[PDB]
């Protein structure tokens, strides 16, 4: 079991999102996804760097999924830098994290 954490910034309902958190009918293989709902106002880089690199210390996780509902023009680039410095895959889903970029580090 590898913990998967989801982070979202903005106005949203925690219970509505958490209703479908434990809804993946993955009985074929024992994935056991320990989905954790994380909500924090982390637009600034300081909040992101002090939270992303602290998650592994508390909870043993090898995968992070990021979502957002803001129109930031450079959040995707600054969030991509953590992926380059680590080996934990991260996926941009919603908001500025899904904006286009030219190239990625190898």
């Amino acid at each position: 079991s590898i913990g998967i954490a989801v982070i979202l910034v903005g106005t949203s309902d925690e219970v509505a999102i958490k209703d479908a958190h434990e809804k993946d009918d993955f009985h074929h293989l024992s994935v056991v996804p320990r989905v954790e709902l994380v909500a924090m106002n982390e637009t600034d880089p300081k909040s992101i760097i002090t939270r992303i690199c602290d998650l592994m210390s508390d909870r043993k996780i090898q995968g992070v999924v990021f979502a957002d509902d803001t129109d930031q023009e450079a959040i995707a680039q600054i969030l991509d830098f953590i992926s380059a410095q680590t080996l934990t895959p991260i996926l941009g889903i919603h908001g500025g994290s899904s904006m286009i970029m030219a190239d990625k580090d190898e």
Partner: protein, 49 residues
Amino acid sequence: IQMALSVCEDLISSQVYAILVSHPPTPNDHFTPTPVSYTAGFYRIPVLG
């Protein structure tokens, strides 16, 4: 990794309008300015190498 933590929690808060990139102790290294120009480039702060 500590560069982003150290640069933006100790330098940008001190009202700096220009930042100079350091020099790697080993010339074959590369990641001396790559953390400096990322965090400092968020706020359109000129950086000199």
